[PDB]
RNA sequence: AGGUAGAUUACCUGACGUUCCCAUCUGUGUGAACAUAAUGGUACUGAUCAGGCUCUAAGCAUCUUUACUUCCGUGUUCGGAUGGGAACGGGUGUAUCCUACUUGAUAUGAACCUACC
RNA sequence: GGGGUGUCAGAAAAGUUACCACAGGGAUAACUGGCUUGUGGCAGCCAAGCGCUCAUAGCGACGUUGCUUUUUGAUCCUUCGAUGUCGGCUCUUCCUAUCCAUUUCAAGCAGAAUUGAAAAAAGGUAUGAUUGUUCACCAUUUAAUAGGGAACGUGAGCUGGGU
RNA sequence: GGCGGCACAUCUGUUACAAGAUAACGCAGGUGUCCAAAGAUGAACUCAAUGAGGACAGAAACCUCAUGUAGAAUAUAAGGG
RNA sequence: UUCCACCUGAAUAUUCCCUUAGGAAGGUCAAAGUAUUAAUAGUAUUGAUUGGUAAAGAUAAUGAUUAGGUGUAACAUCUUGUCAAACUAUGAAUAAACAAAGAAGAAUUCUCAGUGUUAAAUACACUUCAGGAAUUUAAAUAUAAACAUACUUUGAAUCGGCCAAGUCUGGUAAGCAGGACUGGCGAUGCGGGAUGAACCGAACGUCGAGAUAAAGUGCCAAAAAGAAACAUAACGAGUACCACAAAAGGUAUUCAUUCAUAUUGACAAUAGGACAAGGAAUGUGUAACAACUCACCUAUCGAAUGAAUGAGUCCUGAAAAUGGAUGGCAUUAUAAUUUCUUAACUGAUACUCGACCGUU
């Protein structure tokens, strides 16, 4: 009862029906694994800007 | 050239462009393939492209003007009749006496029997 | 106990030369590839004829040797010992395999064993070349036609307009020899050039 | 039937260029990579540590992170019927700056050179220059007249066959 | 006869030359690429080195940072300009190595304007101790890396005499006090070599052994009248004089053409003349 | 012109001979001390009586090599396409892409920072 | 972390049924048929030599080209809710690569007896000992006692010796 | 089908078609280990081979110079470095 | 395994399994439900690359291999002939992955902060090119794309496949076994190939009229007349896949090329000689000398002759079993084969136009 082992036949036709799904833009903007110092620098400014924005809200 | 075995083509004359548009002309309006009946419908579609009647349609296509891409895209593909396609058969190039490939100015004879 | 020639005539598969992975190869039938006046200078024999193979096929070493023997015997009879030089221009570098089957045996689980040697020739490839004098040209043509009966497929006799195994046609070799660009080398010629350090 | 080793079928891919063995340039370790740059991943088999997978060889990616010793490169990988984003960290030995935007970055500078003069010509009131014309495929050549003064004719015909032998 | 010369075209076709400077025996590219590699997240920030090369007659010190176009020298100091500071003779001693290293530090610090907060040590009493520049207020000292090239780093090697002078000059160079003229005994052994005590003890040793041997080795010292006792004091003043004016110093030079090429016209004529003579 | 550090890594290499050295570099003298080894040959240090002998560098050669260009040659091979030809084997025509080896001509380095002449 | 599952994503596991049984399978073997033709069989081309001299009356080495399905292989397309599986007896028909008889040509054809080949398949091609035998090998007789096919012709035709 | 083999977990070159993937009980081989150093680092040196010399010493003992792009070595199969 | 019409419409890869007649993850598919949407490409062009296949090479590295010079069998050295799936310097075609302006369509000027790098920074890095304000601005290859594009959820069936080939491997080979790319059949009818799952044309709602495709035009069978040739005294030829034929031989025939004799006289034939001209005189032949005859030379006679090579066609090679298959009849300066000429013709459910039904 030997059988055919493998074939790539019809595989490209199948893969192109619903064509190659591209990744979304948000996939290229991930930050995990970035430089430790650059993350430390970015977080410091974001905290500074947010705290300065919030005191303006309290003022007005 | 890549699709040569499936098409035949050539260089149209002014009369071929005139008769093709006059008899088989149609425009894609609102997703509908509406045939050309008046100059008012031409102005409504391609008026912003400085094309208002059926003669600027012919002139812009024939001379390949600055608005060819937009004017040609609005033109729906022509549905033509049948004709004696080849001398031997359409399985060989027109150079070898067949049907497909580039016919240059001899594409007009095929279109005359096809329009 | 040799299979018919129709079994190993088509060029199939990658070349399978004798190497460290292909052992137990029987020795080829043909050992001599140059016959006749092997040491005759390039100026004695101006004529040149070829056997051109018009078929893409394997040529067995057995058919090479059988053709070599017939040309050798026919030529010594006609052109003598010092009247011709015939060179075989195909070598048996391809090894054919046999799947020998002897119900006490397998059916299809096996691979070929070394069976013999052959050359993978192509269309227009020169098989055998020769050179002799003007008077002995008919001897070549007759003996070369008889040799083609030992090969398979289509062969054609070509009478080259060049010199005796050179690349120059007969008048160019004549004028290059008289100028001094041709130097005798026992059985061939050396091209004098204008390169390298000058002499003193 | 191949095996499934990490560096299978790499006899010729990982072989060094002819007469190109040994140490590499110092421009490889001195080039400055910034986030957003375009680089080409080139597996240098002379350095076995940190060798990128052979499937990324010759692919053009973008720099997404810069570390003290390695450069974060981002490439697109084709999977069953989708494309995924692969984020590698490769030492500068195995990457190389890409010229994929060489022509584009020139066209960017050419239009900015004209734009600089435009903001100055507007102050003086003179007409301002137009932006460079866009690239087009080879257009049909126009009609041209050829002088007969320095013309020479050579007949072209089929050739009589001559046997090479 | 038998040759079997392995220099045929097959040899040269597959031959791969080394790097040009390694081919010249001047660059250890394996060690160089370690000292040139700045951190990739320090974009284009120079990684300074000290190139200390000692010739047969002078000590060369240069502060360099590598670039793709080529190495760029920020500042340099030589021992052949030492006589301006009173060191007339012996420009390759352990003492002249120290002065050149010290002079380069002061010359560099003045260029950057940081010569007032970074002073290092000045008194000769504390010359033999290991000193490293430290932070002043919040400002770090100028940092450099030592590049010894193809020089063996033994205990008493002069490449660390230059490095010792820089640290005393206020420029921070990472190091350990295990390859100084001391690294054994104490600071008095290092101080004696820096002040030329080893030099001004062979002059007197040779005098007590043989007069002609004395004139052989120190012949130009008698001509200049430099007594052995004077060597110790002149190096004290040279350090003092270096620290008060290191700002470098201030034409058409006679050029000597050497051989010049032959054009394609003369080269063709030479071949034809040689061929014509043969006939 | 020379020296230091280089980047390109043979147009930079290899062999045969030639040309200067005024500074520089090199070769050169010595072994007391740091340090070194079986050996002051190397590496180390102290020095300056001599020298262009070598190195380095500049140039020479119908020099090997290497590097560009033509040619090789639209010849090898190749993507697309017959109810095209052939009993096979293999090989057209059409719309296209088009190497390599060889040979011949030219070249034998360009170029960055610092110092000194 | 280690102890380990090697059938390596990891049950704890010996045979034999000819006394056998069930669900199924032409997904798969034993017979025919079909593709192939190595092997078996038959036929050619060349011509080194054999044949007292003489390559070809008769042969034909070294090579090389085909045909056949009368051997045995190779495969697994049909048949597993079954195509009765060997031989012999009986009987008809077909092929020719002709054993005899008829007509011819050639010979190393004097006669006789033979040998090679062409036309030709309308007619003939036996009796027995041993063996189930196909085959084989013997004893005869004959003008000759040729080779094969038809589901390896032929079991609601027999027989049942073989299996 | 059984007997054989393991193509059952696995690595290298090739078949394999210059991205990736990639068959056969296709081809040539390999693994179930070995290492307190054969791991880490620093320094010094240059290997195989050949030519010419040196008491025994010779084709092979050790010493010296020159040439030497790796033709050696790198635990192992093969391929890379 | 039980009613109808309508719409969409597959599969044989990959991973794991005591797995191999079966399952689960996943791919293909349907139905529902969304989003104004940094969310288009089985394409080409231009630009910078990647690769090591075809090819190529072989005193270019590894390995194999024939011979010839020169110098000191051997070794060097210069040549020569032929090679590699597990050799390679070089290296295509077809390809792979980039870019051609989305922190949301550019750019510039001014102002400018937090951290850190830095010797220190006004350099540099990240922070919506932190942020903020003015001015300018819709430009940046071709083509196509709003019933576009991006999908989300839920779920079916399937993972025995088979065929073709300007492809490959094992095998002598197979309507054999196994693969790379694509198109098919399966799931598919229609026109043609007589017949046929896969070939060719072309994919289908019910119809009318026309131009067509493959392919055909003696009759069966709708439709063609003319032109030239190589064939055809034979079951020769006659619609690819396809249902078969080879080496070889022929004073069979047609065309082409090359050489020689070709006339003032070749070859064929007739006569004399054969000692302008004759070989110890060629064969027959006399025991041998002799005679006839041959090569050869004269005489006679007045248009081509002789040899080689190549390409077509024909004949031989060519033998199997029920009677039979260019499909049959039949054709034979064709009604066969090859090529043409003629604004000749026939013909599909495909194309055009029109009428009607349904889906969107």
TrEMBL record, chain A:
Biased composition, class Basic residues, residue ranges: 11-24
Region (Disordered): 1-24
Biological-process GO terms, alphabetical: cytoplasmic translation
GO cellular component, one term: cytosolic large ribosomal subunit
Pfam families, per the entry: Ribosomal_L29e (PF01779)
Keywords: Ribonucleoprotein, Ribosomal protein
Record keyword Ribosomal protein present: yes
Keyword check for Ribosomal protein: yes
Residues annotated as transmembrane: none
Family as reported in the entry's similarity comment: Belongs to the eukaryotic ribosomal protein eL29 family.
Protein's recorded name: 60S ribosomal protein L29
Species this protein is from: Entamoeba histolytica (strain ATCC 30459 / HM-1:IMSS / ABRM)
TrEMBL record, chain B:
CC annotations in GO: cytosolic large ribosomal subunit
Entry keyword annotation includes Plastid: no
Protein name: 60S ribosomal protein L7, putative
A Gene Ontology molecular function term of the record: RNA binding
Taxonomic source organism: Entamoeba histolytica (strain ATCC 30459 / HM-1:IMSS / ABRM)
The keyword Metal-binding belongs to this UniProt entry's keyword annotation: no
An individual GO BP term: maturation of LSU-rRNA from tricistronic rRNA transcript (SSU-rRNA, 5.8S rRNA, LSU-rRNA)
Keyword terms, alphabetized: Ribonucleoprotein, Ribosomal protein
Family recorded in the similarity comment: Belongs to the universal ribosomal protein uL30 family.
UniProtKB/TrEMBL annotation, chain C:
Keyword vocabulary terms for this entry: Ribonucleoprotein, Ribosomal protein
GO MF: structural constituent of ribosome
GO biological process, one term: translation
Gene3D superfamilies: Ribosomal protein L10e/L16
Similarity remark: Belongs to the universal ribosomal protein uL16 family.
PANTHER family: 60S RIBOSOMAL PROTEIN L10 (PTHR11726)
Name the record gives this protein: Ribosomal protein L10, putative
UniProtKB/TrEMBL annotation, chain D:
Membrane-spanning residues: none
Pfam families linked: Ribosomal_L21e
GO cellular component, one term: cytosolic large ribosomal subunit
UniProt keyword Ribosomal protein, yes or no: yes
GO molecular function: structural constituent of ribosome
InterPro entries: Ribosomal_eL21, Ribosomal_eL21_CS, Ribosomal_eL21_sf, Translation_prot_SH3-like_sf
GO terms classed as biological process: translation
Domain of life: Eukaryota
Entry keyword set: Ribonucleoprotein, Ribosomal protein
Family: Belongs to the eukaryotic ribosomal protein eL21 family.
Descriptive protein name: 60S ribosomal protein L21, putative
Origin species: Entamoeba histolytica (strain ATCC 30459 / HM-1:IMSS / ABRM)
Lineage: Eukaryota, Amoebozoa, Evosea, Archamoebae, Mastigamoebida
